[PDB]
Structures are given as structure tokens and as C-alpha cells.
Amino acid sequence: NWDDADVKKRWDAFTKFGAATATEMTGKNFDKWLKDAGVLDNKAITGTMTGIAFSKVTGPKKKATFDETKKVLAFVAEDRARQSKKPIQDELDAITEKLAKLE
């Protein structure tokens, strides 16, 4: 459960410390964070937005850091949010709000 403040804490940490290779999570593990959350299903969602997101944010298969992470989360949220509603922030708040109770 990423708390309101905790979300900022865990995100911010990446920039403050520069946690590239310091508790790094493989692309598989980050992909897990996405698919298990229900945001990036990779089932009905586009391959365009999702694939290019990873290809842009991380590059290799290992991981990245804060900026790259906020990029991809935005791209994934934007995927379906922007099609119907358009504002990406709406679905990000939704994601954050969903996973708040979705453990």
C-alpha cells in the first residue's frame, strides 16, 4: 500500500540517491507492477503505447529511475485515458487511487 506521502517518498528516493543500481527492479518486475495493477494489461491494451514506453523510458531490460518511471506511467495511463477522456492526470490519479485499496 503506497501511502499518499509514501508515493512521493518512494518516487523521490530515486532522484535524491540516484538509485539506478540500488534496489533495481528488472523490466520483468516493473512489467509485473504494471500488469498486476491492471493498468497495463498487455491483453487488450495497445502495443504501440506500451512497447514504445519501455523502449523510451528504460532502454535496456534492467531498469532506469524516477524520470523514466514517471514517463512510462504517464504513457501507460495516457493510452486509454487520452482516447476517450484525454486528460492523462485523471487516469494517473485513478491508478494511484485504485492501487491505494488494491494493495
d(CA 24, CA 101): 25
CATH number of the domain encompassing residue 14? 1.10.238.10
Domain tally for the chain?
Answer: 1
Q: Which spans in 20-86 are helix H? A: 27-37, 47-57, 66-84
d(CA 94, CA 55): 25
Closest to 81 measured CA to CA, from 69, 94, 68: 94
d(CA 98, CA 5): 16
Print the domain residue range for 22: 1-103
Q: Mention every residue, 6+ apart, whose C-beta is less than 8 A from residue 5.
A: none
- H-helix or E-strand containing 103? none
